[PDB]
Ligand binder design. Structure first.
Ligand SMILES: C[C@]12CC[C@@H]3c4ccc(O)cc4CC[C@H]3[C@@H]1CC[C@@H]2O
Ligand SMILES: C[C@]12CC[C@@H]3c4ccc(O)cc4CC[C@H]3[C@@H]1CC[C@@H]2O
Ligand SMILES: [Ca+2]
Ligand SMILES: [Ca+2]
Lengths: 175, 175
């Protein structure tokens, strides 16, 4: 079962989850995505939308990560185009001080020395938003148009042990 | 004709070129590299080894860029392993405010918003060192052992119009 990553004209995420970082052990997430859209947000995460935030999206068909925290601030593209209408496996892992991006079983990007441990963030509540940002797109380091006309399936985010809340799936729309 | 990227035990580059940035028009370089070595420096560049420097190397077989300037400071891995004993084409381009890395005809990395124009650097003299750094390896954001047991060929760096000086090829060693 797959869900649409955008619902209608709005830019809002289709879903938000929140996690207690004092209870994280697994610091990775995995999902499959399918789209013909070259630009948009796949997911956004933060502990503070002003001071500690992360965005995985597509620009010109390829993955783009933007992140802004006390240790690093960056806008980076990598990997193959994904806007070919095929399902693609994506894994985004925090390992040590690094963020790893794997696409279709291949590591395509490693941002080294970019974060302290999730355990120790100043604010111990992490949000993950699917298909949109939790601030205006103009707040990005490099704006894009967030709407991603795509589908998401087989998605797991950190683990249930850490999860405090998840948005109502009443609004989710099947693909 | 190919040359070795390391000569004996020392860490020093095998060659240094310097350029007048007031005369650059082409801001890209291209070469082929072949190695079985998973770690080392391919080339280093700077306008100031303290304040504005760039390194392309291999770590765990894959490209790594480190760069430190007024606008960005980063350590990033991307692309496939290159330590498979095959010749690989590499192109490193500055385009707008971005650095592009292309391997075997595929863009594998785009560092966006990382530099002002080469035209306008505070110091208008750029050095490019092949096979080594122009400071101690401990000065890197993330140290590696610089010696790269590999070969380089078909290399062009910016253009001759901009070049002020090039090291004596008396020390270069053929592969
Ligand atoms: C933990 C994840 C990778 C690392 C991400 C990160 C990494 C650094 C940072 O300062 C904030 C965030 C928030 C979102 C995190 C992501 C949410 C899911 C993904 O697996
Ligand atoms: C111009 C090159 C790409 C951009 C590199 C860069 C990029 C940003 C910066 O602040 C310094 C340097 C120095 C070395 C430059 C490289 C030397 C050859 C390569 O093509
Ligand atoms: Ca879009
Ligand atoms: Ca080596």
């Amino acid at each position: 079962p797959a869900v649409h990553l955008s619902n209608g004209p709005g830019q809002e995420p289709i879903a938000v989850m929140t996690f207690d970082l004092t209870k994280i052990t697994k610091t990775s997430s995995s999902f499959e995505v399918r789209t013909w859209d070259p630009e948009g947000v796949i997911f956004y995460g933060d502990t503070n939308p002003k001071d500690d935030w992360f965005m995985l999206g597509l620009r010109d068909g390829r993955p783009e990560i933007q992140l802004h925290n006390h240790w690093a601030q960056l806008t980076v593209g990598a990997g193959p185009r994904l806007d070919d209408g095929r399902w693609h496996q994506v894994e985004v892992k925090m390992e040590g001080d690094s963020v790893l991006l794997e696409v279709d079983g291949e590591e395509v990007l490693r941002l080294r020395q970019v974060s302290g441990p999730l355990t120790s963030k100043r604010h111990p509540i992490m949000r993950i938003a699917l298909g949109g940002l939790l601030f205006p797109a103009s707040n990005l380091r490099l704006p894009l148009v967030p709407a991603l006309d795509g589908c998401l399936r087989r998605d797991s985010w950190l683990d249930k042990q850490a999860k405090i809340s998840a948005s109502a799936p009443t609004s989710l729309r099947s693909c």
